[PDB]
């Protein structure tokens, strides 16, 4: 987007300016702000289309040497600055400081001119053609140079030598504005995706490995642990730096920085469990995707399984040796587990029982039985704190199983509604056709039409899709849709592009099935048709009169006739035909609007077949009958009727 | 579909041709391609409706003997070929090679003629009526025969005797084109279903029997196994051959052939598990059907049960004797199973325990407890690898149970939405009628109307179904719907079929409940009605004036009157009445368009009851009162009003 005006008016700070066209003779004004309207005393429409030299603002005391200096700076495309007595709408002699900056382009062309203004009346000299008094003209000069003296020469009324300080500072403000004349009238991440992916898999790593290291407590795991720490710190500084600079840093310190700092800095290793705060960055990224939330629920299901498995082992380990009496108590899932798999605990000391890998996967098996509502009961809780933990994990497993089932059911509901609406409309059409006892050929024809247009369109109301778009986008879409007419016919290559869009907005598109007829003989012809694909036959009295191929126009010339006629012939299709039709009313609307186009349209459009003009012909069977009639070789009430035919 | 033009233009290869009507006198042209338009120098509309003898193309030097030869070949319907000097639009003497082929039919009738052309100017002789020079006319002859000499006589400029080689080859190309004149202007599997069914049940067989033969390891099973192999190979060659010949074979080798070849060719019997790649052929075939996907999920549920049951037995068998120390380890579901059912393992050697049928069905019971989330725990895992397998199968069973529950819920949601929309609109209608305190008779009448039209229509917006169809199909559907008028009335049997469709598109259809009145006395009559079923009464002043049966027309004649009138009588229905009404505006539109029909319509349509013309009558109670009035046996302000009635 090109915010060429907004940057100038933001930098300007109550100073005023006009914009003129640098590439047009006499340099006409294309824009003037309200400050220039107030200082000039003119209105926007009255300012624009005048010269940006502001020759209408000149006067008898306006120096012509400054005028040709302005002309030279406009011709040479040169940043300059001048002061000149110019007049207003009330013809007051007002000295102006015009600063002219050419405007380059992305193509570096000198396309515009910027002329900024101020009032230098009080700064130089008061000169009046007539005034009430010297104080009155002086007061008018001070009131005119109000925003010059006021909001720029603030402390300058205390000091002397304002021409040496404050006027030079206003000229330097115009110089910094010329430094800000850079917008030049032109329009002015995958690393984040890959970074969020690798920190997501590392958050899965730490959510597996931290409760593992809490409960069950090499070297290369410590190496990759330090890699996890430094990559997390790089992610913190990237969450500082990257887009949504200092305002997003303050927003990050408000939002998430305390958790993300304490997450990755000896019991406080459980504080590392808060590293899943990074996962909420990706959770919004794939909540729109639906089938991946099933994968999200399965992943958090396994993650919570690993979590509460380590919690379950922690409960067993807290329970076996909770006292200094060192009793096994004959009651724990660890003790029943050691009696189950073998090697019960022994003492010589207290020699441990089961191996830690078997312990972890046995505990994960137990937590999976809990969260999956299976519940075998090999490992099954019998101590107090493990039982209240069992209640807790069963209440969590119910909700996790519910969320999985609801997500799967919603996935199936979308995947089934998208086909069920089509199957239901097909079933209702079959029900309707069976209701009214359509002859089976026509029922099959309408049915295979419905299946064919549902295979082609895939269930898209394309006209409604065009209603979703705005006006110009829909018109340009229609122009691309009717490129198959407009690039092909000589009738349309002389049209204006506005006429192209105002035509293309009226063109329906027909997908004719083979064997299906468009205009039956006797139907109203009200829409000339262009054939962009397929092959057509024209049947007059059971006889093929015209074969229409690609790029042919039939129907009836409306703009010459202005008369509705009957189709003198059937028009049937031979192949899958693509037609681009236009009714006569919209055609006549466009042709009445585009008057200079319509004559060239009449001269260029040659109908391949008039569907009004019945063509006279005889069959060869008829002249065979006439040749047979050599073997054969009152009229007064009827021949007068033939004389009425003579009167006809 | 009849692609009569497309085959000719595909075979033609830059040669040009016209198509003329063989059954019409003077043999008029029905088609000419752009090559003929370029060679002739004429436009498509200017070519067509001229003779296919191209008599307009003839000249002073055109041989009349060739003209009558062309006439004889057209009359006798004979494939021939000629060369003749003919003229163009700029009247240039151009020698043509016309090749004429009659076009047969599916009915073998000589319906069209094909006349193909080329330029034989340079090949025979240059003859000009006038030219600039001999080289100029020679250059025009070479430029005219450009596509003849260029893209056909390619290497012939190197050789001599072009009349003996290249011109004969172009005539032979026309001969092969006459061999390709076969399209003749005419339109040009259950074994796959049964084959996919029997390979589907065989894929169920191999998916049951291969893990059975992997884990648990007669003769007739080997016989039917070899039948499975040979039927699978026949399916491979049918997937090569059958529709979607060589392109589908290359697409099959890209798509599925490697898997389907390695699937059916001693440990690589597990490779036979990939035979389920055939099932993806049927999975797309019944994904549209919805209730069968429940059967699909139950079948893959039992199939995965059998799979992981064999995997479970494999885990037990791998676990009992994993070492050469030959320890039972007192820990396996096989060992606990043998201690459960009886016969523990013994040695004398190692005598086995449980019987293999009991082992398989016990393992299948266990896998069903896992996948059904029941989890009794007779068989319940206690070794390491069986526990991580238990985690795996519980994570699979959760998703399988979720998919089953989601599919069942979607099935119930479709089966319930289809009745819930009707029950909800009925509840809202009852709520609305109870809201405004309708007298209970009228509420019951509207309610039983709604239930009656929902029993009859079964919830089908039949007008919207007509909007789904295209124009001609909707018109033909409407013609079949109003066959009950058009086959019955003498008013419509003189109509054009275009008038039939343009009328039938305007006919509403009313299902009058008995006791319900159409036109109340005083309502506007604007729609003449045809009664195709039922019985009606016409009430004027509480007295039945006309009983209307099947095939009667009431309303008002609009086209004579062109005046809107009031209904002078109530028109009530006696039975379930089927009416086909048409408003006066669409009727007047059609009758204004079909002018020659409207007179016969006026002559033939006799109204069974004018609803405008009030009929004068007296009641017998009134004349009984008048006979009573014999016992009974100022006017000037009122009788003058009666004189005003005389003025009326």
Curated annotation (Swiss-Prot), chains A, B:
<dbReference type="GO" id="GO:0042734">
    <property type="term" value="C:presynaptic membrane"/>
</dbReference>
<dbReference type="GO" id="GO:0031901">
    <property type="term" value="C:early endosome membrane"/>
</dbReference>
<dbReference type="GO" id="GO:0042391">
    <property type="term" value="P:regulation of membrane potential"/>
</dbReference>
<feature type="transmembrane region" description="Helical; Voltage-sensor; Name=Segment S4">
    <location>
        <begin position="266"/>
        <end position="283"/>
    </location>
</feature>
<feature type="region of interest" description="Required for phosphatidylinositol bisphosphate binding">
    <location>
        <begin position="138"/>
        <end position="149"/>
    </location>
</feature>
<dbReference type="GO" id="GO:0006813">
    <property type="term" value="P:potassium ion transport"/>
</dbReference>
<feature type="topological domain" description="Cytoplasmic">
    <location>
        <begin position="1"/>
        <end position="195"/>
    </location>
</feature>
<dbReference type="GO" id="GO:0071805">
    <property type="term" value="P:potassium ion transmembrane transport"/>
</dbReference>
<keyword id="KW-0407">Ion channel</keyword>
<keyword id="KW-1133">Transmembrane helix</keyword>
<feature type="glycosylation site" description="N-linked (GlcNAc...) asparagine">
    <location>
        <position position="330"/>
    </location>
</feature>
<dbReference type="GO" id="GO:0030425">
    <property type="term" value="C:dendrite"/>
</dbReference>
<keyword id="KW-0539">Nucleus</keyword>
<keyword id="KW-0966">Cell projection</keyword>
<feature type="short sequence motif" description="Selectivity filter">
    <location>
        <begin position="373"/>
        <end position="378"/>
    </location>
</feature>
<dbReference type="GO" id="GO:0030673">
    <property type="term" value="C:axolemma"/>
</dbReference>
<keyword id="KW-0325">Glycoprotein</keyword>
<keyword id="KW-0812">Transmembrane</keyword>
<feature type="transmembrane region" description="Helical; Name=Segment S1">
    <location>
        <begin position="196"/>
        <end position="216"/>
    </location>
</feature>
<dbReference type="GO" id="GO:0099509">
    <property type="term" value="P:regulation of presynaptic cytosolic calcium ion concentration"/>
</dbReference>
<dbReference type="GO" id="GO:0009986">
    <property type="term" value="C:cell surface"/>
</dbReference>
<dbReference type="GO" id="GO:0099508">
    <property type="term" value="F:voltage-gated monoatomic ion channel activity involved in regulation of presynaptic membrane potential"/>
</dbReference>
<dbReference type="GO" id="GO:0071277">
    <property type="term" value="P:cellular response to calcium ion"/>
</dbReference>
<feature type="transmembrane region" description="Helical; Name=Segment S3">
    <location>
        <begin position="252"/>
        <end position="265"/>
    </location>
</feature>
<dbReference type="GO" id="GO:0044325">
    <property type="term" value="F:transmembrane transporter binding"/>
</dbReference>
<keyword id="KW-0631">Potassium channel</keyword>
<protein>
    <recommendedName>
        <fullName>Voltage-gated delayed rectifier potassium channel KCNH1</fullName>
    </recommendedName>
</protein>
<keyword id="KW-0851">Voltage-gated channel</keyword>
<dbReference type="GO" id="GO:0042802">
    <property type="term" value="F:identical protein binding"/>
</dbReference>
<keyword id="KW-0813">Transport</keyword>
<dbReference type="GO" id="GO:0005637">
    <property type="term" value="C:nuclear inner membrane"/>
</dbReference>
<feature type="topological domain" description="Extracellular">
    <location>
        <begin position="315"/>
        <end position="358"/>
    </location>
</feature>
<dbReference type="GO" id="GO:0008076">
    <property type="term" value="C:voltage-gated potassium channel complex"/>
</dbReference>
<keyword id="KW-1003">Cell membrane</keyword>
<dbReference type="GO" id="GO:0042127">
    <property type="term" value="P:regulation of cell population proliferation"/>
</dbReference>
<keyword id="KW-0770">Synapse</keyword>
<feature type="transmembrane region" description="Helical; Name=Segment S2">
    <location>
        <begin position="220"/>
        <end position="240"/>
    </location>
</feature>
<dbReference type="GO" id="GO:0098839">
    <property type="term" value="C:postsynaptic density membrane"/>
</dbReference>
<keyword id="KW-0472">Membrane</keyword>
<dbReference type="GO" id="GO:0005251">
    <property type="term" value="F:delayed rectifier potassium channel activity"/>
</dbReference>
<dbReference type="GO" id="GO:0005886">
    <property type="term" value="C:plasma membrane"/>
</dbReference>
<comment type="function">
    <text>Pore-forming (alpha) subunit of a voltage-gated delayed rectifier potassium channel that mediates outward-rectifying potassium currents which, on depolarization, reaches a steady-state level and do not inactivate. The activation kinetics depend on the prepulse potential and external divalent cation concentration. With negative prepulses, the current activation is delayed and slowed down several fold, whereas more positive prepulses speed up activation. The time course of activation is biphasic with a fast and a slowly activating current component.</text>
</comment>
